Amino acid sequence: DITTLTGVPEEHIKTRKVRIFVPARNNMQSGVNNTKKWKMEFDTRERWENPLMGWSSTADPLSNLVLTFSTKEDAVAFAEKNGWSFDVEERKVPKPKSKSYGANFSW
Amino acid sequence: QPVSEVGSRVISCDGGGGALGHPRVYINLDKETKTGTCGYCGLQFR
Amino acid sequence: PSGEERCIACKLCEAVCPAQAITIEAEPRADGSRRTTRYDIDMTKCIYCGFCQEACPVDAIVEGPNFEFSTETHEELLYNKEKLLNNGDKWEAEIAANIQADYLYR
Amino acid sequence: LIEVFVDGQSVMVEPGTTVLQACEKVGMQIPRFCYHERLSVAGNCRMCLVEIEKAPKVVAACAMPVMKGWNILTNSEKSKKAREGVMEFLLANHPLDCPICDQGGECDLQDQSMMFGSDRSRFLEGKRAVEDKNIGPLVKTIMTRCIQCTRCIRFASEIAGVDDLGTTGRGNDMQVGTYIEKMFMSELSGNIIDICPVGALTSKPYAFTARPWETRKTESIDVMDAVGSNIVVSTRTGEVMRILPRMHEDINEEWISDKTR
Amino acid sequence: GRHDWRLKGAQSRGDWYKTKEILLKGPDWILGEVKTSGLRGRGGAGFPTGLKWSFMNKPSDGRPKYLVVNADEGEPGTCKDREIIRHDPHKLVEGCLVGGRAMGARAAYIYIRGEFYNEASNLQVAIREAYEAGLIGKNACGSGYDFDVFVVRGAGAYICGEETALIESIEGKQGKPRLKPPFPADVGVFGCPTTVANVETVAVSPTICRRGGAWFASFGRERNSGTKLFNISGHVNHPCTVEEEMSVPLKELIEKHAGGVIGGWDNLLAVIPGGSSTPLIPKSVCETVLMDFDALVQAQTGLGTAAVIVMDRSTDIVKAIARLIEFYKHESCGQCTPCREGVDWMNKVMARFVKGDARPAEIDSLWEISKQIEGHTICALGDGAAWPVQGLIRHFRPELEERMQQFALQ
Amino acid sequence: NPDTPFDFTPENYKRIEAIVKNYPEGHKAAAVLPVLDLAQRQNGWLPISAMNKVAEILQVPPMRVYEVATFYTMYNRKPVGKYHIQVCTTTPCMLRNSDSILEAIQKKLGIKVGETTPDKLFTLIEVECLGACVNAPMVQINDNYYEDLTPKDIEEIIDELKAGKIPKP
Amino acid sequence: NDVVHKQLSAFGQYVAEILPKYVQQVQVSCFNELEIFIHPDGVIPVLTFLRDHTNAQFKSLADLTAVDVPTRQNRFEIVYNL
Amino acid sequence: LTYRYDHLGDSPKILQDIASGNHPFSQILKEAKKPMVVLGSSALQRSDGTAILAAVSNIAQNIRLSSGASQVAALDLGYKPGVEAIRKNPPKVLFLLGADGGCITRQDLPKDCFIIYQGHHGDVGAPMADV
Ligand SMILES: Cc1cc2nc3c(=O)[nH]c(=O)nc-3n(C[C@H](O)[C@H](O)[C@H](O)COP(=O)(O)O)c2cc1C
Ligand code: SF4
Ligand code: SF4
Ligand code: SF4
Ligand code: SF4
Ligand code: SF4
Ligand code: FES
Ligand code: FES
């Protein structure tokens, strides 16, 4: 634990959680590249609206933060070094599937 | 604006001039039941 | 020249400004043409780099020749869409003159 | 299960199975359009051409099953010239609509144009363009941006089960639009807005409202059904924009309903 | 074989005779009689026909095995099958029975162009007589083997000339040819294994089964075995169908069978063997090339199924090629992209060429863009559209260029 | 042709069954192409209702039927004239001067290409290789090749068309 | 240029042999930039010799960059130009 | 439904009949590998839902002998009956969302008009609910 070393206010090592996962493919895309490699998104908090101009004014210190990884164990251990609450999720690689142009012409 | 009409078929609308208007686009006129409004220009055709 | 506005909310002016001064919120025209609802910008954050000037495919937003508009109150800096149009109305012969004199080099 | 060489390294690939699936197994990714797993293979849109280790002419990656210790140079120069070759053809008619087309943020055709397609244009004539075919409350057909990966029909006949829409005509002028004005309503009509390769078919209700690089993409699950399908909700800052399916083998698998969408 | 299309006329060809004997209830020897005959594809494929048919030899697997003659009149310059079917249905029928037996095939559908209505009808009549004599069906002209012919009509689709496209045309699906590797040899119509053959091949097969197949081998070059019909057309004195030895030089067959060239001009000029095959410059065309297809391969050219397009310089070559490419552009379904869009592309340019409005540098790109299609489309029609143009760029460049500048003066 | 009306004659049901027999029992869809021809043989034209009718007969979805109706050239969504002229346009006839032919007929009717005569009896159409390539300029009008054409000859044959009889000459 | 890539290569080998108590690897970025690794304890001794002549009279730090990376058993990754 | 499938008759009829193997369909159900019987939630009401469940359960028993939202969550934690059939009128109902069941009847309301409504739309439940 390195909580004292980081200047981070207690609130945000406490009352919020990281949410490790390998990101899903954008489904509009047929691409696969961005899918791989663990990342460490935090939970969303409140974000209201600017009384003037209608801007999405926001309070939380660290909403936009996000971090890539090569391995999940490294990620969990990472947050543990930070003393972080976490929600590890499985890599969900698609099952391989059989394909056949001629099966379309059975009968 | 008056609706421009041409006896041909497909036409190209650049929004007026070359390289000062919207990207060149061709507005089809397959259906005479409706005008051919330009995507960017907003100018109808038939 | 038709009197129609040029902007078509391809919204990449938002997507290329380094200061991200721009904020856009398009909704469909009743006619069904793409349009902005609240194009806005704030000179408080804009750095006058002229990336927006380059970026627009329909050449809508333009970095105008006017260089003086120092003002009393911060809230005035944060231009609304209507304000930009009024600036486009005030200067149009002028701007069209510059672009006319310049575009070949682009 | 047969040994097969992806460009260099040996791979003990499953018997049969398409060359595409082989390189997918090594993880290298062939450029694609018309093919789609959870759909069906087809020979159109020959953007997947790849070069055999020895046989002089390239073959569609999703066509030929691998066998007998094949080697395949995905990065081979002749393959690359092939891909540029095709891409110029696809771009020979797709209308200059990127700024307005609502697919503009992530249309696969753009990225394929970047990664592979030659940058100079060298078409110098006149694009064909065609009238719209109105279809229902939802989908905003535009066509013209159509590239005849039949895909959507292979969606309809093979999953929605409706075969109302289909290809029509020959050569250029052939159209994936259904003949006759009749509206196509179905419960899986919404998912095509996902499936459609380009902006030729995009959701009217969400149209114009937002751009892909903007929205944050939260993961969760549907509630309109107790079926509990996984999803990617997408919000442009403090407000939901659009829903998309998130693939999951036990349930939705890349699909989603429609009332939920 | 031109005279009397009825069975009475087949008697001039000697009818069936010992055909019942040919049915020894096993292809095999006749199959060998085919393989030894050295016959190759008359569809312009040129594939070893006996080898081609041997592929179906495998013990049934229980799915009924079929046969489908590729009868069509789509290619330009090609009117070979017309007078044939109009004047000798029966030998074609006998070939259907013999070769259908060669597959052991249950049946023989035969697709036609729908334009051939009247003789699809007369064919239907002669086939009806074939049922009347007990020649076909149960037992079928002796030997006791059942076999079942049919003849489908078409409807204005030259793409159906391609075999897999035709198979796909049969089920009521559009003439959109299947992707490889499944084959009619593997999965043809419906789901059952099938096969396809040019009218020449099937009509002449029983004659291989009577007169020696080695006798077939005797003619032409050994790798260009046998004989073939030769249409002659274009600037020619007496245009006509003429079957002939494969090895025959072209100036020979023209200046003999065809009534000769109209002058020494065209001898200097291009003359196209078939259509999809490229035109060739030389005053020494035939003087070099021999009509047997391999000799044309020496000339970087296909046989084109032996249709012949004589072309005098009274006519500009460019107008002809352009109109040809128009003929392609109207027809190619377009399911595979490079064809669908590239062919139209080439037409769009050729228009500028006949206009002569094009800048010269374009031609290289054209020749370049042709390369892009040249191997890629899923079926040969795109390739067939591709080649001739490459030949034209290979050759008659100055005509093009000078046409360009002379327009450029304006 | 507002989705109405159409129905087959009984003799036609007879014929279509007689040819539907020609296909293996597992898949009747193969019957689609010939059947349309008969409708074409009947109406002389193809109202959409007829397509729906055939579709209902073979149980196949109407859309596949439309695919077939459109994909081919011989079918005719627009009404044809009592004599639907159709004529070679591919190069070998051009080498044999098909131009003088088409120009002769055009000089006659005054029709320009695909437009019908107002009398609605003739419909000129330039046509891709008829496959009768061996022979001189050629024309066919509803399944009837005419050959060794001379521009006056065709005119004479339009005359004989008005005489109500034709050979195949 | 091939030449520079050669000289840097050989020189990398040269130092690799002169003092291999710690040079984990002497990768040459293909655009002519040599860059050896060091065990963290080994910093002073290497750099020391790096000023000291043999050819390594690489005087003056250009910089002391500190690339970060969340992964890895130890995240921070220090770098010394010379 | 889009695909070919056998159509049956009426509840107790075809159900209890196949359950007693009166239906020929019961036979094909017998020879079938890993049989799946699916019963919709809609059937569970229909006046006598329990009877329908009993019939389908018997079919399950037969196969084995031969051999060869706001719903499933509550039953994961036993909130049955779940149905409003306990009543016995009980004052002060507490809607989580009366937009659904508020369409039914407000019969307890004359006895007690009060209804806390913890919804997220003004639909149905809100207008007929205090607090
Ligand atoms: C009348 C006719 C038209 C043909 N048209 C085409 C065509 O348009 N495209 C094509 O690729 N092949 C075409 N072919 C060739 C077929 O694809 C097939 O390979 C051939 O007919 C069979 O050759 P074989 O008779 O030598 O076995 C045609 C063949 C015939 C007889
Ligand atoms: S570029 Fe100019 S016009 Fe196109 S969207 Fe951004 S601002 Fe609106
Ligand atoms: S001015 Fe320069 S910085 Fe401010 S928005 Fe336009 S481009 Fe981006
Ligand atoms: S979506 Fe269609 S139009 Fe918009 S960019 Fe991608 S390709 Fe060009
Ligand atoms: S519909 Fe969607 S898939 Fe079918 S062609 Fe048009 S774009 Fe490609
Ligand atoms: S390849 Fe090109 S031409 Fe041959 S069939 Fe497929 S599309 Fe038609
Ligand atoms: S997917 Fe291989 S051809 Fe389009
Ligand atoms: S050449 Fe034109 S029809 Fe035969």
Coordinates of N, CA and C in Angstrom, one line a residue, chain C:
Chain C
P1 N -24.2 32.2 -51.0 CA -24.7 33.4 -51.7 C -26.3 33.2 -51.8
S2 N -26.7 32.0 -51.8 CA -28.2 31.7 -51.8 C -28.8 32.3 -50.6
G3 N -28.0 32.5 -49.5 CA -28.6 33.0 -48.3 C -28.7 31.9 -47.2
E4 N -28.6 30.7 -47.7 CA -28.5 29.6 -46.8 C -27.2 29.5 -46.0
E5 N -27.2 29.0 -44.8 CA -25.9 28.9 -44.0 C -25.2 27.7 -44.5
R6 N -23.8 27.8 -44.4 CA -23.0 26.7 -44.9 C -22.8 25.5 -43.9
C7 N -22.7 25.8 -42.6 CA -22.4 24.8 -41.6 C -23.2 23.6 -41.7
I8 N -22.6 22.4 -41.6 CA -23.4 21.2 -41.7 C -23.1 20.2 -40.6
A9 N -22.5 20.7 -39.6 CA -22.2 19.9 -38.4 C -21.5 18.6 -38.7
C10 N -20.4 18.6 -39.4 CA -19.6 17.4 -39.5 C -18.8 17.4 -38.2
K11 N -18.9 18.5 -37.5 CA -18.5 18.5 -36.1 C -17.0 18.2 -35.8
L12 N -16.2 18.1 -36.9 CA -14.8 17.8 -36.7 C -14.1 19.1 -36.3
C13 N -14.7 20.2 -36.4 CA -14.1 21.4 -35.9 C -13.9 21.2 -34.4
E14 N -14.8 20.5 -33.8 CA -14.7 20.2 -32.4 C -13.5 19.2 -32.3
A15 N -13.3 18.4 -33.3 CA -12.5 17.3 -33.2 C -11.0 17.5 -33.5
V16 N -10.7 18.8 -33.9 CA -9.4 19.1 -34.3 C -8.9 20.3 -33.5
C17 N -9.7 21.0 -32.9 CA -9.3 22.1 -32.1 C -8.5 21.6 -30.9
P18 N -7.3 22.0 -30.7 CA -6.4 21.7 -29.6 C -6.9 22.3 -28.3
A19 N -7.5 23.4 -28.3 CA -8.0 24.0 -27.1 C -9.4 23.4 -26.8
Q20 N -9.9 22.7 -27.8 CA -11.3 22.2 -27.8 C -12.3 23.3 -27.4
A21 N -12.1 24.5 -27.9 CA -12.9 25.6 -27.5 C -14.3 25.3 -28.0
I22 N -14.4 24.7 -29.2 CA -15.7 24.5 -29.8 C -16.6 23.5 -29.1
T23 N -17.9 23.7 -29.1 CA -18.8 22.7 -28.7 C -20.0 22.7 -29.6
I24 N -20.4 21.6 -30.1 CA -21.5 21.5 -31.1 C -22.5 20.5 -30.7
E25 N -23.8 20.8 -31.0 CA -24.9 19.9 -30.7 C -25.9 19.9 -31.9
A26 N -25.6 19.1 -32.9 CA -26.5 19.1 -34.0 C -27.8 18.4 -33.8
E27 N -28.9 18.9 -34.4 CA -30.1 18.1 -34.6 C -30.7 18.3 -36.0
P28 N -31.5 17.3 -36.5 CA -32.0 17.4 -37.8 C -32.9 18.6 -38.1
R29 N -32.8 19.2 -39.3 CA -33.7 20.1 -39.8 C -35.1 19.5 -40.0
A30 N -36.2 20.3 -39.9 CA -37.5 19.7 -40.2 C -37.5 19.3 -41.7
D31 N -36.7 20.0 -42.5 CA -36.5 19.6 -43.9 C -35.8 18.2 -44.0
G32 N -35.0 18.0 -42.9 CA -34.2 16.8 -42.9 C -32.7 17.0 -43.2
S33 N -32.3 18.2 -43.5 CA -30.9 18.6 -43.6 C -30.2 18.6 -42.3
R34 N -28.9 18.2 -42.3 CA -28.1 18.3 -41.0 C -27.9 19.8 -40.7
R35 N -28.1 20.1 -39.4 CA -27.7 21.4 -38.9 C -27.4 21.4 -37.4
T36 N -26.6 22.5 -37.0 CA -26.3 22.7 -35.6 C -27.5 23.2 -34.9
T37 N -27.6 23.0 -33.6 CA -28.5 23.7 -32.7 C -27.9 24.8 -31.9
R38 N -26.7 24.4 -31.4 CA -26.0 25.4 -30.6 C -24.5 25.4 -30.8
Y39 N -24.1 25.7 -32.0 CA -22.7 25.9 -32.3 C -22.2 26.9 -31.4
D40 N -21.1 26.7 -30.7 CA -20.6 27.8 -29.9 C -19.1 27.6 -29.7
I41 N -18.5 28.7 -29.2 CA -17.1 28.8 -29.2 C -16.8 29.8 -28.1
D42 N -15.6 29.7 -27.5 CA -15.3 30.7 -26.5 C -13.8 31.2 -26.7
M43 N -13.7 32.5 -26.9 CA -12.5 33.1 -27.2 C -11.6 33.0 -26.0
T44 N -12.2 32.7 -24.9 CA -11.4 32.6 -23.7 C -10.5 31.4 -23.8
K45 N -10.8 30.4 -24.6 CA -9.9 29.2 -24.7 C -9.3 29.1 -26.0
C46 N -10.0 29.6 -27.0 CA -9.5 29.6 -28.4 C -8.1 30.1 -28.5
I47 N -7.2 29.5 -29.3 CA -5.9 30.0 -29.4 C -5.5 30.6 -30.7
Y48 N -6.6 30.8 -31.5 CA -6.4 31.4 -32.8 C -5.3 30.7 -33.6
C49 N -5.3 29.4 -33.6 CA -4.3 28.6 -34.4 C -4.8 28.5 -35.8
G50 N -6.0 28.6 -36.1 CA -6.5 28.4 -37.4 C -6.6 27.0 -37.9
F51 N -6.6 26.0 -37.0 CA -7.0 24.7 -37.4 C -8.4 24.5 -37.9
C52 N -9.3 25.3 -37.3 CA -10.7 25.2 -37.7 C -10.8 25.7 -39.1
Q53 N -10.0 26.7 -39.5 CA -10.1 27.3 -40.8 C -9.7 26.3 -41.8
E54 N -8.8 25.4 -41.5 CA -8.3 24.4 -42.4 C -9.3 23.3 -42.5
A55 N -9.8 22.9 -41.3 CA -10.6 21.6 -41.2 C -11.9 21.6 -42.0
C56 N -12.6 22.7 -42.1 CA -14.0 22.6 -42.6 C -14.1 22.2 -44.0
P57 N -14.6 21.1 -44.3 CA -14.9 20.5 -45.7 C -15.8 21.4 -46.5
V58 N -16.8 22.1 -45.9 CA -17.6 22.9 -46.7 C -17.2 24.4 -46.5
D59 N -16.1 24.5 -45.8 CA -15.5 25.8 -45.7 C -16.4 26.8 -45.0
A60 N -17.1 26.3 -44.0 CA -18.1 27.1 -43.3 C -17.4 28.1 -42.4
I61 N -16.9 27.6 -41.2 CA -16.3 28.6 -40.3 C -15.0 29.1 -40.9
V62 N -14.8 30.4 -40.6 CA -13.6 31.1 -41.2 C -13.0 32.0 -40.2
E63 N -11.7 32.1 -40.2 CA -11.0 32.9 -39.2 C -11.0 34.3 -39.8
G64 N -11.9 35.1 -39.4 CA -12.1 36.4 -40.0 C -11.0 37.4 -39.8
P65 N -10.8 38.3 -40.8 CA -9.8 39.4 -40.9 C -9.9 40.4 -39.7
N66 N -11.0 40.6 -39.2 CA -11.2 41.4 -38.0 C -10.3 40.9 -36.9
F67 N -9.7 41.9 -36.2 CA -8.8 41.4 -35.1 C -9.1 42.2 -33.9
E68 N -10.1 43.0 -33.8 CA -10.4 43.8 -32.7 C -11.8 43.7 -32.2
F69 N -12.0 43.2 -31.0 CA -13.2 42.9 -30.4 C -13.0 42.7 -28.9
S70 N -12.0 43.4 -28.4 CA -11.8 43.4 -27.0 C -13.0 43.9 -26.2
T71 N -13.4 43.2 -25.1 CA -14.6 43.6 -24.5 C -14.6 43.6 -23.0
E72 N -15.6 44.3 -22.4 CA -15.7 44.5 -21.0 C -15.9 43.2 -20.1
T73 N -16.7 42.3 -20.6 CA -17.2 41.3 -19.8 C -17.0 39.9 -20.3
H74 N -16.6 39.0 -19.4 CA -16.1 37.7 -19.8 C -17.2 36.9 -20.5
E75 N -18.4 37.1 -20.1 CA -19.5 36.4 -20.6 C -19.7 36.7 -22.1
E76 N -19.3 37.9 -22.5 CA -19.4 38.2 -23.9 C -18.5 37.4 -24.8
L77 N -17.3 37.0 -24.3 CA -16.4 36.3 -25.1 C -16.9 34.9 -25.6
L78 N -17.8 34.3 -24.9 CA -18.2 33.0 -25.1 C -19.2 33.0 -26.2
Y79 N -18.8 33.2 -27.5 CA -19.8 33.4 -28.6 C -20.8 32.3 -28.7
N80 N -22.0 32.7 -29.0 CA -23.1 31.8 -29.4 C -23.1 31.7 -30.9
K81 N -23.9 30.7 -31.4 CA -24.0 30.5 -32.9 C -24.5 31.8 -33.6
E82 N -25.5 32.4 -33.0 CA -26.1 33.6 -33.6 C -25.0 34.7 -33.7
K83 N -24.2 34.8 -32.7 CA -23.2 35.8 -32.8 C -22.2 35.6 -33.9
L84 N -21.9 34.3 -34.2 CA -20.9 34.0 -35.2 C -21.6 34.4 -36.5
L85 N -22.9 34.1 -36.6 CA -23.5 34.4 -37.9 C -23.5 35.9 -38.1
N86 N -23.7 36.7 -37.0 CA -23.8 38.1 -37.2 C -22.4 38.6 -37.6
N87 N -21.4 38.0 -37.1 CA -20.0 38.4 -37.6 C -19.9 38.0 -39.0
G88 N -20.6 36.9 -39.4 CA -20.4 36.5 -40.8 C -21.2 37.4 -41.7
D89 N -22.2 38.1 -41.1 CA -23.0 39.0 -41.9 C -22.3 40.3 -42.0
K90 N -21.6 40.8 -41.0 CA -20.9 42.0 -41.0 C -19.8 42.1 -42.0
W91 N -19.1 41.0 -42.2 CA -17.9 41.1 -42.9 C -17.8 40.4 -44.2
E92 N -19.0 39.9 -44.7 CA -18.9 38.8 -45.7 C -18.2 39.2 -47.0
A93 N -18.3 40.4 -47.4 CA -17.6 40.8 -48.6 C -16.2 40.8 -48.4
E94 N -15.8 41.2 -47.1 CA -14.4 41.2 -46.8 C -13.7 39.9 -46.7
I95 N -14.4 38.9 -46.0 CA -13.8 37.6 -45.9 C -13.8 36.9 -47.2
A96 N -14.8 37.1 -48.0 CA -14.9 36.5 -49.3 C -13.8 37.1 -50.1
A97 N -13.4 38.3 -49.9 CA -12.3 38.9 -50.6 C -11.0 38.2 -50.2
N98 N -10.8 38.0 -48.9 CA -9.5 37.3 -48.5 C -9.4 35.9 -49.1
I99 N -10.5 35.2 -48.9 CA -10.5 33.8 -49.4 C -10.3 33.8 -50.9
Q100 N -10.9 34.8 -51.5 CA -10.7 34.9 -53.0 C -9.3 35.1 -53.3
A101 N -8.6 35.9 -52.5 CA -7.2 36.3 -52.7 C -6.2 35.2 -52.3
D102 N -6.7 34.2 -51.6 CA -5.8 33.3 -50.8 C -5.9 31.8 -51.2
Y103 N -7.1 31.4 -51.7 CA -7.4 30.0 -51.7 C -6.5 29.2 -52.6
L104 N -6.0 29.8 -53.6 CA -5.1 29.1 -54.6 C -3.9 28.6 -53.9
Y105 N -3.4 29.3 -52.9 CA -2.2 28.9 -52.2 C -2.6 27.7 -51.2
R106 N -3.9 27.5 -50.9 CA -4.3 26.4 -50.1 C -4.3 25.1 -51.0

